[PDB]
Amino acid sequence: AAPYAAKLKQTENDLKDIEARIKEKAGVKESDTGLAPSHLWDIMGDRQRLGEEHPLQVARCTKIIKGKYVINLKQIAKFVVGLGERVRPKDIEEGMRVGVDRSKYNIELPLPPRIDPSVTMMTVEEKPDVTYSDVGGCKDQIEKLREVVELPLLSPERFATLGIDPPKGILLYGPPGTGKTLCARAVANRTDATFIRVIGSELVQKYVGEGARMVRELFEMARTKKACIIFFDEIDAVGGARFDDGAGGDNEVQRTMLELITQLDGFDPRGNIKVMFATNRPNTLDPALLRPGRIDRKVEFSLPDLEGRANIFRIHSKSMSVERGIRWELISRLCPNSTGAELRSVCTEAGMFAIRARRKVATEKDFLKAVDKVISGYKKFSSTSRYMQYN
Amino acid sequence: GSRRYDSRTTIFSPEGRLYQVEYALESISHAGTAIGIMASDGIVLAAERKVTSTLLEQDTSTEKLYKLNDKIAVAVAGLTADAEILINTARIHAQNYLKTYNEDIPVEILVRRLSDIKQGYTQHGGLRPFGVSFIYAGYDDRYGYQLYTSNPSGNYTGWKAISVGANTSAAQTLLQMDYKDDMKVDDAIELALKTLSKTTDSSALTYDRLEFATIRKGANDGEVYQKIFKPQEIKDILVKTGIT
Amino acid sequence: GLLHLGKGTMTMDVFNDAHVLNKVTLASILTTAVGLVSPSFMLKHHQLFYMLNAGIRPKFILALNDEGEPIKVNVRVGQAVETVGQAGRPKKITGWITQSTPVLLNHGERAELETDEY
Amino acid sequence: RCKLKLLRMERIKDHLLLEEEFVSNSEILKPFEKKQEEEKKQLEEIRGNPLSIGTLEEIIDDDHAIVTSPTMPDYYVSILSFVDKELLEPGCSVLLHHKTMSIVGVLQDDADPMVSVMKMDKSPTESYSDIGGLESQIQEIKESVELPLTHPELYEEMGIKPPKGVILYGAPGTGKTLLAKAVANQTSATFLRIVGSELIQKYLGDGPRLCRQIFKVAGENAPSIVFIDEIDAIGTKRYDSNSGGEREIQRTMLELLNQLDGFDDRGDVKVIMATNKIETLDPALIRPGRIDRKILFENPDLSTKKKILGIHTSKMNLSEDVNLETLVTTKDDLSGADIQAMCTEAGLLALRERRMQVTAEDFKQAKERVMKNKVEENLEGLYL
Amino acid sequence: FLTRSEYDRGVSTFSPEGRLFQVEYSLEAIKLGSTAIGIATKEGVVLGVEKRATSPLLESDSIEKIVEIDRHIGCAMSGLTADARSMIEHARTAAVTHNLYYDEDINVESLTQSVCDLALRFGEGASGEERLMSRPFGVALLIAGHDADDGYQLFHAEPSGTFYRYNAKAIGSGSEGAQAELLNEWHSSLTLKEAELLVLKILKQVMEEKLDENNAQLSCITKQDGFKIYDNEKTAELIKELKEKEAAE
Amino acid sequence: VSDFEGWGHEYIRHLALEIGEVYNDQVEKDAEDETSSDGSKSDGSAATSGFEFSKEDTLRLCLDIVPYFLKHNGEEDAVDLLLEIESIDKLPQFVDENTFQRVCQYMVACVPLLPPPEDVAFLKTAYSIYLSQNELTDAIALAVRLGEEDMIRSVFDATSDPVMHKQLAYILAAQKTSFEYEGVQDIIGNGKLSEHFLYLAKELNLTGPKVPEDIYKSHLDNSKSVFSSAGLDSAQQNLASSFVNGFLNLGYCNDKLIVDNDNWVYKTKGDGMTSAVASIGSIY
Amino acid sequence: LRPGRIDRKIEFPPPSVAARAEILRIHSRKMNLTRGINLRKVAEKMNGCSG
Amino acid sequence: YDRALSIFSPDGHIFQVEYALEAVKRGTCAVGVKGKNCVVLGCERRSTLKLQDTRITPSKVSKIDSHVVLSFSGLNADSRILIEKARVEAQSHRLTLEDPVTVEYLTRYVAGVQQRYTQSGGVRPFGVSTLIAGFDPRDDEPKLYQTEPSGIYSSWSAQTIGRNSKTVREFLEKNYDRKEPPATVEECVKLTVRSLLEVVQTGAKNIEITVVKPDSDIVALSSEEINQYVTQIEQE
Numbered sequence A: 001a002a003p004y005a006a007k008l009k010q011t012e013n014d015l016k017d018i019e020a021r022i023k024e025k026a027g028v029k030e031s032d033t034g035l036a037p038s039h040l041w042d043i044m045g046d047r048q049r050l051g052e053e054h055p056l057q058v059a060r061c062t063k064i065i066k067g068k069y070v071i072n073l074k075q076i077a078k079f080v081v082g083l084g085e086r087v088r089p090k091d092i093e094e095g096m097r098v099g100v101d102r103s104k105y106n107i108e109l110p111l112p113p114r115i116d117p118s119v120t121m122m123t124v125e126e127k128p129d130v131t132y133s134d135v136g137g138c139k140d141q142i143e144k145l146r147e148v149v150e151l152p153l154l155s156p157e158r159f160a161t162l163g164i165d166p167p168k169g170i171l172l173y174g175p176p177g178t179g180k181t182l183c184a185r186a187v188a189n190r191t192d193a194t195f196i197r198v199i200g201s202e203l204v205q206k207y208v209g210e211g212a213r214m215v216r217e218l219f220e221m222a223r224t225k226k227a228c229i230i231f232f233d234e235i236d237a238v239g240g241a242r243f244d245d246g247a248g249g250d251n252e253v254q255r256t257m258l259e260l261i262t263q264l265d266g267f268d269p270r271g272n273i274k275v276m277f278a279t280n281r282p283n284t285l286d287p288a289l290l291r292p293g294r295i296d297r298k299v300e301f302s303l304p305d306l307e308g309r310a311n312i313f314r315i316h317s318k319s320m321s322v323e324r325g326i327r328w329e330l331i332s333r334l335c336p337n338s339t340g341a342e343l344r345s346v347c348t349e350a351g352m353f354a355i356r357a358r359r360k361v362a363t364e365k366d367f368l369k370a371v372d373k374v375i376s377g378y379k380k381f382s383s384t385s386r387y388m389q390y391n
Numbered sequence B: 001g002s003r004r005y006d007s008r009t010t011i012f013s014p015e016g017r018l019y020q021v022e023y024a025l026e027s028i029s030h031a032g033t034a035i036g037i038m039a040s041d042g043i044v045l046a047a048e049r050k051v052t053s054t055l056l057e058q059d060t061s062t063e064k065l066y067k068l069n070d071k072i073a074v075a076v077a078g079l080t081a082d083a084e085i086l087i088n089t090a091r092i093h094a095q096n097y098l099k100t101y102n103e104d105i106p107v108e109i110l111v112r113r114l115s116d117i118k119q120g121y122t123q124h125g126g127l128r129p130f131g132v133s134f135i136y137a138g139y140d141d142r143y144g145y146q147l148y149t150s151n152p153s154g155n156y157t158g159w160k161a162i163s164v165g166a167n168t169s170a171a172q173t174l175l176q177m178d179y180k181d182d183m184k185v186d187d188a189i190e191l192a193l194k195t196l197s198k199t200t201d202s203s204a205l206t207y208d209r210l211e212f213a214t215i216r217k218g219a220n221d222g223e224v225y226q227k228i229f230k231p232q233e234i235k236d237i238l239v240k241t242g243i244t
Numbered sequence C: 001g002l003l004h005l006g007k008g009t010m011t012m013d014v015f016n017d018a019h020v021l022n023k024v025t026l027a028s029i030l031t032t033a034v035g036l037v038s039p040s041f042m043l044k045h046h047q048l049f050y051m052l053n054a055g056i057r058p059k060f061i062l063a064l065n066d067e068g069e070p071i072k073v074n075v076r077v078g079q080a081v082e083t084v085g086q087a088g089r090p091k092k093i094t095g096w097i098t099q100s101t102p103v104l105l106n107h108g109e110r111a112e113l114e115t116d117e118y
Numbered sequence D: 001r002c003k004l005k006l007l008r009m010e011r012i013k014d015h016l017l018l019e020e021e022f023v024s025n026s027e028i029l030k031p032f033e034k035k036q037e038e039e040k041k042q043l044e045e046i047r048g049n050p051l052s053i054g055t056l057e058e059i060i061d062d063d064h065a066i067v068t069s070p071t072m073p074d075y076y077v078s079i080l081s082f083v084d085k086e087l088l089e090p091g092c093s094v095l096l097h098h099k100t101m102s103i104v105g106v107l108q109d110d111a112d113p114m115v116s117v118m119k120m121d122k123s124p125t126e127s128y129s130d131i132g133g134l135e136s137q138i139q140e141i142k143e144s145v146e147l148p149l150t151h152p153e154l155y156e157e158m159g160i161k162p163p164k165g166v167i168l169y170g171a172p173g174t175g176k177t178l179l180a181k182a183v184a185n186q187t188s189a190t191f192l193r194i195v196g197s198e199l200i201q202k203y204l205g206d207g208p209r210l211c212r213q214i215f216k217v218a219g220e221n222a223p224s225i226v227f228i229d230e231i232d233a234i235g236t237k238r239y240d241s242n243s244g245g246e247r248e249i250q251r252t253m254l255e256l257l258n259q260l261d262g263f264d265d266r267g268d269v270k271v272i273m274a275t276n277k278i279e280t281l282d283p284a285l286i287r288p289g290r291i292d293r294k295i296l297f298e299n300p301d302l303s304t305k306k307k308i309l310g311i312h313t314s315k316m317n318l319s320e321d322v323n324l325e326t327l328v329t330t331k332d333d334l335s336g337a338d339i340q341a342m343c344t345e346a347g348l349l350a351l352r353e354r355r356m357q358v359t360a361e362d363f364k365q366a367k368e369r370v371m372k373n374k375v376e377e378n379l380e381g382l383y384l
Numbered sequence E: 001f002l003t004r005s006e007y008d009r010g011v012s013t014f015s016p017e018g019r020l021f022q023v024e025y026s027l028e029a030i031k032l033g034s035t036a037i038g039i040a041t042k043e044g045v046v047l048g049v050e051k052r053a054t055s056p057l058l059e060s061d062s063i064e065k066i067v068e069i070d071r072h073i074g075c076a077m078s079g080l081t082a083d084a085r086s087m088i089e090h091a092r093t094a095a096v097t098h099n100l101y102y103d104e105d106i107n108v109e110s111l112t113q114s115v116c117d118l119a120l121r122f123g124e125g126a127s128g129e130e131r132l133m134s135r136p137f138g139v140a141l142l143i144a145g146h147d148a149d150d151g152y153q154l155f156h157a158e159p160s161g162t163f164y165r166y167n168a169k170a171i172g173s174g175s176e177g178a179q180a181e182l183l184n185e186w187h188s189s190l191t192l193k194e195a196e197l198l199v200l201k202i203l204k205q206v207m208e209e210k211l212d213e214n215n216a217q218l219s220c221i222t223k224q225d226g227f228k229i230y231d232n233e234k235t236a237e238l239i240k241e242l243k244e245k246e247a248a249e
Numbered sequence F: 001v002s003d004f005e006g007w008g009h010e011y012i013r014h015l016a017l018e019i020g021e022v023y024n025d026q027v028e029k030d031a032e033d034e035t036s037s038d039g040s041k042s043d044g045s046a047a048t049s050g051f052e053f054s055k056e057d058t059l060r061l062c063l064d065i066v067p068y069f070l071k072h073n074g075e076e077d078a079v080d081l082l083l084e085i086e087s088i089d090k091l092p093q094f095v096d097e098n099t100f101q102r103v104c105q106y107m108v109a110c111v112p113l114l115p116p117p118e119d120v121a122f123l124k125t126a127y128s129i130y131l132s133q134n135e136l137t138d139a140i141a142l143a144v145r146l147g148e149e150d151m152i153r154s155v156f157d158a159t160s161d162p163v164m165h166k167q168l169a170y171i172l173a174a175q176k177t178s179f180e181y182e183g184v185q186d187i188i189g190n191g192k193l194s195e196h197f198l199y200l201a202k203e204l205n206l207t208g209p210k211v212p213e214d215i216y217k218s219h220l221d222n223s224k225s226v227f228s229s230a231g232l233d234s235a236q237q238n239l240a241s242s243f244v245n246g247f248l249n250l251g252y253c254n255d256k257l258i259v260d261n262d263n264w265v266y267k268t269k270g271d272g273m274t275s276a277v278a279s280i281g282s283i284y
Numbered sequence G: 001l002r003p004g005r006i007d008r009k010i011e012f013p014p015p016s017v018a019a020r021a022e023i024l025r026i027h028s029r030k031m032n033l034t035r036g037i038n039l040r041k042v043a044e045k046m047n048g049c050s051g
Numbered sequence H: 001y002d003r004a005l006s007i008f009s010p011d012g013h014i015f016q017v018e019y020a021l022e023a024v025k026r027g028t029c030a031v032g033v034k035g036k037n038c039v040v041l042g043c044e045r046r047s048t049l050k051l052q053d054t055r056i057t058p059s060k061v062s063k064i065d066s067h068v069v070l071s072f073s074g075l076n077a078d079s080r081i082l083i084e085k086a087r088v089e090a091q092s093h094r095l096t097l098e099d100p101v102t103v104e105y106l107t108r109y110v111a112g113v114q115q116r117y118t119q120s121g122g123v124r125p126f127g128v129s130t131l132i133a134g135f136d137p138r139d140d141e142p143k144l145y146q147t148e149p150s151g152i153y154s155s156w157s158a159q160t161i162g163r164n165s166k167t168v169r170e171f172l173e174k175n176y177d178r179k180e181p182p183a184t185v186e187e188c189v190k191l192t193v194r195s196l197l198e199v200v201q202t203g204a205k206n207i208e209i210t211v212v213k214p215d216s217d218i219v220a221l222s223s224e225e226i227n228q229y230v231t232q233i234e235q236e
């Protein structure tokens, strides 16, 4: 071979060895958090320490006895407790968690109920500023929503002047790519109510009856919350129709399907819980989660018109740098009846053709290519006729 | 009802294709090796029986070789039961042609007619195909000696040397290596026996497991002598070639 | 640029100011920002103020040379691009196909381009 | 060859780094400075001896929390609170005090063996143009995967949102697999790779939690590219039918819609999907704006194979005998994995010899073995 | 693909809709058809079709979708043309039969209705008459004609077995973009040439290639000249005179 | 003959005997046949002719001992022995490009093996090999590396002297010197042109950094201008703000009007004024 | 079995009669036989279909 | 049996026609180009297999009348049925209407033939596509038609079907001219040979050419002839 290979073999293995050695000798570090705006904490940190004032065994009430209480600890171990002098008796309720002394069990500080939910604190969501003007068109279907959901939060006066019961529920349905969830992110901007977002496939667990716990508790936590909205997303699985199999495994799923019914109507009403169901499909749903008194007005969300595509595309191309004198009308005509999510992608693929020609701008030429590009792939793909019949 | 249970076996696959044909071809590679080698002086058809027992009678057995007419014989490989029907249909067609023209059928016509019959079963009716492959040895004056193979699809191809049944590919390579453009019937016999000796599933190749027939221009001035040999003549030519 | 191996001359005022405690006086120095790289554009006898096309390659495969050299594959781009820095430094010439021959090669150099048309 | 000097030069930079590093640690890391001594002192004075790993269920905004320990008993713990009141969140591992349990501190990070499958230590020894050939349908995967990470500046001139997503589809062996692994060497951002046969499980309920996870990790590190190899595997692979079946497959797809785009607003997860069963996917999956430019791959043409075959035989020994052009003649619109299996099997002929020369004979012979594969699961011979 | 359907095992089976599924499918195969536009006035009926080239090697002046039934009835097919091949033969036969029996011109409606009787024969063997089809036809016709008793008529014949008399109708892929315009632009004061240029107008907008006489074809039915297919030269003249009035806006 | 394992290890040993020897001649004080680790001499007409003969053979198809001989001597003489052989081989025995890669691979690779006095002496020969070859584009780059004024003029002369007209040659010369934004080349080439005497107006500018002003304007027009500066009166916060406007207008930008308001210039004080006018300069 | 994923494929046949004697011989070292027993005789009494 | 082998698809199709088209894509490739006074059908034959008798085996171009040729791609077995029906119709025309067929009428007949096994019950379509070419009698216009298993018929200036027809079609856009055919027969032949060598490759023994000239002259050129033509193309 070549007269270096005999020693390239060794020189190269030396590279591999020394990288391991540098890393090993240098050592690593793993933070154990502190704070630079703190350098003294133990002047009365030791009062929280070392001289107990005290951390507490958490328990749960199982029996109020009228004039002591029975708690069963989390260490499963049952004890009889009473009232200290930071407790109020009016403030003990069934199933509430309490703190008791780690030595001689006595209630010191009651505590919020129910430690079993901990994965519903990650479905509580801050409102993304997708803005309320972000939604396409000035069409009227979103104005129906502003009558059911938004306005009674702002003004229950006019509904008190009417005296009607204000409608609470509404169905969001229609084709995808219409921005089903995109108008609900807008409405999350405006109303500034709590949004609690659910995934239907997130409601299915390994063992059955485990998701029954989930749904029930999620609802009651929302009852305590005031001025809240629960956004049922993608509940095509759990949420579907009820039927029998006689040997299925669908039964175990249908349990949590039922759990959704029994909380909506309840034996108590929804106290300012506005409810959205977002379904891709009306083709299969429950007839008691689609009964008209608990989903009150249901709004079909449609495909943009020949005007509606011009409005959406103007929101999109006003956001893009194009060189003036163009038609947003023309591009809508060229398209068949279609989604705006395509219109969101006519701009961006026309922009990849804009960078290809190395324009800072976008012109008519590159728009034409883009319109062809998407249509041709649509034909190559499902849902150019799929609606799964019904209206 | 009945549409319920209908299997639809004559439809295409996503391939554009017919599973039943493929499956028939698969089942014929479970059946015996049949070989046709064309010499310039005749044709050798050599077939290896599938069954062999020291209690089997192999002396009235012509399970693989059949005369369609006294110029055209076949080697049969596949389902025997289906093949029998086609054999008698073939003879009937031969006699029909002889009937209306008073002159012996060319090999062309017969091979094609049978191919059409097979084609009908795959084309329509919901029926399964006839799972047979034929090697036709024939003599006609127009093209002389003719060797043909046809398959359950209803397609035919002429060949200079061909093998069907078990180990098609192996015997084909062998024949490539050992073929001459012109040969004798003796040279052809030798090559045939040898090829079956290297492809036989039992360690030894024996006369009692060989069916062996020729059509020879020994007979002169435009006569051909068919011969379906006796196993005792097969024995002797098996010792000639030195296998036994 | 011509040599990436070369050390600068105008960029040394950027290099200069780290050994000294900060003052308003040093703040005066920093308004200078020279060290600049030209945007390469193809040239002619009448002076063309734009480029035509270029190839750029992020990852070479050659270790028989420290940087390798861009092979004839690169990502193609159009006119009007400043010299691309690290993560884009190997730059190949795209002018061959228009019946033009580069006179001034490119690797990622600062150098301007010039071409000859048949 | 002739790279010995540069490897010695790299090695030499390594010697100098190992040296100065080592001595710096050793004895002149001087902890005789008070901003080291005094900070650790009174940090250890509240910090344990046993540090009692706990699991934080939730926090209360009165400088307290409820922990549940894996040993058992819960506790209503205090917090020393030099640790930044609001820096700890459900799912944390917290250090409790061996006396009265107070949150001494907080561990920053912890991991699963199920995300070990997801994450990677690798650094491919192939970089692009070992995908040499098919070099214009690869501008659709380095102008919407590579480039907006490299330059957002270009997409700022035009403004509006930058690209998102690709689906790769075409024949098997046409490079789909290596395309994904080749952009990941260039970009040097967190490359997750997950097989679709692990997204299909024989247990339900944990299916969705796996799929939900991938993108939550992926958004958590600010740049990531998630390779889902084989999303064609979700309708053809299935175990039992009483914990697999329609149901399992439907849920996981549903989960992926929320994750892929949905309402999460998670971090950057550029997605790459390989598939050749694209019609077993939803219309809300192959919906635009999750696929922006979709790439079609078909078999190369005759002159494209010349590009492919020259890449593969550069690694091999050559002679003047070898002729690449006539190997191309024989093949007719076949995959580049077929070409790649001829060159691999050509050295298997050289291995068989124990002769280290590769010759035109070795390439032609393995050509016949490669064509033996194509037409001998066929039994027609000529098209019936 | 594989749109959810409970019934595709029968060809005459219900359907919690209450209607046949196969018929429904048939009407979704007219949306791939090449656009045929037809304007009916009280002065004649104009049938325009896009001949649809697919290659410049394809000779497109030897293919056409204008098909003569008889001197006083013309017909345009859109959808699946292999099915129309059979139907148009049947219709020609019917017309000749009427003239044999009665020495008289057949009503445009009676003819349309006969072919609708033809369309509904799919089945495995049911009602009093034998089913000689097994799957419904996927092709729709625009039957134009003139009879001396109701004047000019334009009928849309469906693969359903239903027929609607239109005053103008477009079918094919671009049928909706055309029909929106029909609703607005049509009236009963048109003249023959005005309707002719109107056809070329709406054919422009559903044009996926470019308008010229090599992928576009006109034909008329007029009372005293019968059914006449416009040759390509004449068509070219009209296209250019459209371009004159298009640059006058 | 037919590649196999054996010679892939044995043949390296043949070459290594000569290799080791030449290296050992610098380290030792015994030196070639008095060093007994090889017992062979590197001088004579017995082994020195073996090195040269080997070099021709290993050059033709490969590159093995060829780079390696040069540096072990430590002399630029060695590199010049190879110059002769290669410059014949530049076109016919293998392409120009392959040759260019050979030359630069020698210099870039051996840098940590070439202290300053050795390193420059090696780059001279490299310059000569290019000058022999067609690419005068390669010559200029390497001559700047050396830094010798003589060689800058030599590549400039190579295009200039042959032609009695402006041909591509003079445009190309002006470009080659233009590249250095140091401008040591620029001054040198401007005065060769006056001597040669063709058009002055285009050529001297093009050698100089004048034309580079022109193209910056073409690029600026595409880029645009942005102003986003703060401004508040009276303190270090005012001093900061007025500096910031130029810090956003680095390179040639258009901000004529902002400069024209001399108010804020005066509202900085002391040294602040100095740095305020200084940031105005960076706008242009 | 797609291209380049599998590159060596090893078929195993049922045993020969020489190979079947060779397995028998290994087993006889565990046992205590009598002299004069041929294991090529035993391998011919067998025909096997597997090891 | 009267049960359907044709089920309507909600896609706007029938699955079996799609599957048929695929079947026709797997078939050997045929090219058709008409000159000004000739027609040329070139066809690939797989003679890669050895010890094949080719004398007695019919070429993949079948004469259906004394002036009308048919070439095919797709299922070889199936095609023979179409071929018999067509020869029969050819004689019928002379019998009842007198004067050999015209290319168009015969094309129309074949179109109806393949169509019928779609629309009927108890039958599946043919996966076969034909190139029908020839002359009308008393005429000298070459007429080249293509029928496809959809039961749809077409006229073409030039056309190609079979395996990898797209490559050759692109070639034909660029080497055949809608305005001008190559006027000499030989040049036409060589244009089609040059076309065939795109995909067919691997020597000049797999190429077959039939040339038809009006006045009922159908002749097929043997391998020797082709060898000469090919080598000329090769040298140039």
Ligand SMILES: Nc1ncnc2c1ncn2[C@@H]1O[C@H](COP(=O)(O)OP(=O)(O)OP(=O)(O)O)[C@@H](O)[C@H]1O
Residues within 6 Å of the ligand: A134, A135, A136, A137, A175, A176, A177, A178, A179, A180, A181, A182, A183, A280, A312, A315, A340, A341, A344, D257, D261, D262, D284, D289
């Ligand atoms: N009406 C609209 N106006 C403007 N933009 C829209 C609209 N609808 C959709 N979009 C754009 O398309 C993107 C994606 O659509 P989105 O994900 O909201 O679909 P979806 O309706 O939730 O469908 P699915 O839930 O079935 O997948 C949005 O982020 C937005 O950019």
Ligand SMILES: Nc1ncnc2c1ncn2[C@@H]1O[C@H](COP(=O)(O)OP(=O)(O)OP(=O)(O)O)[C@@H](O)[C@H]1O
Residues within 6 Å of the ligand: D130, D131, D132, D133, D134, D171, D172, D173, D174, D175, D176, D177, D178, D179, D308, D311, D335, D336, D337, D340, G002, G004
């Ligand atoms: N167009 C090409 N250019 C360069 N190399 C190629 C090309 N196509 C294939 N190869 C080589 O063939 C290889 C085998 O490819 P790989 O296993 O990545 O193929 P694949 O298409 O991903 O296979 P599968 O169809 O099984 O998904 C690659 O690793 C690659 O080096």
Ligand SMILES: [Mg+2]
Residues within 6 Å of the ligand: A180, A181, A233, A278, D262
């Ligand atoms: Mg949604």
Ligand SMILES: [Mg+2]
Residues within 6 Å of the ligand: D176, D177, D229
């Ligand atoms: Mg793969």
